[PDB]
């Protein structure tokens, strides 16, 4: 029998996210040769997306014309066995899929360790690419 016993470990609980503004964003080579094509601007019509481990929990509303969007929005869940929690931007179409802009992907774990004695994290988190965006993410 193991003594390596865990007393390694998944996220049982509650999550809250507040997104509040991201900056930085950049249209892709896609949106710059389609929707963003000759329009006398390339700025995005950005909404936002919060999954947890690939389940959509939370899509913000779509903000129109900018590269630096603020919500001001929130979301919640209940997690079971939960690994990470992922913040994707889109690009709205005018018809058919949204296109990619850029993601950040934040582990449970990393958000525990990081907090310590408390359950909030608040800061500005990295999008890849490009950009980041300033979120209030509590797990209890």
């Given at each position: 029998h193991s003594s390596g016993l865990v007393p390694t470990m998944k996220f049982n609980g509650y999550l809250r996210v507040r997104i509040g503004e991201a900056v930085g964003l950049q249209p892709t080579r896609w949106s710059l040769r389609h929707?963003?094509?000759?329009?006398?601007h390339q700025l995005l019509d950005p909404y936002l997306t919060v999954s947890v481990d690939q389940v959509r929990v939370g899509q913000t509303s779509t903000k129109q014309k900018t590269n630096k969007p603020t919500y001001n929005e929130e979301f919640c869940a209940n997690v079971t066995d939960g690994g990470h929690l992922e913040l994707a931007v889109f690009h709205e179409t005018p018809l058919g899929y949204d296109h990619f802009v850029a993601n950040c992907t934040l582990q449970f774990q990393e958000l525990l360790r990081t907090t310590g004695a408390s359950d909030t994290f608040e800061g500005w988190v990295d999008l890849e690419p490009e950009g980041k965006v300033f979120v209030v993410i509590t797990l209890t």
């Open positions: 929707s963003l094509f000759k329009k006398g």
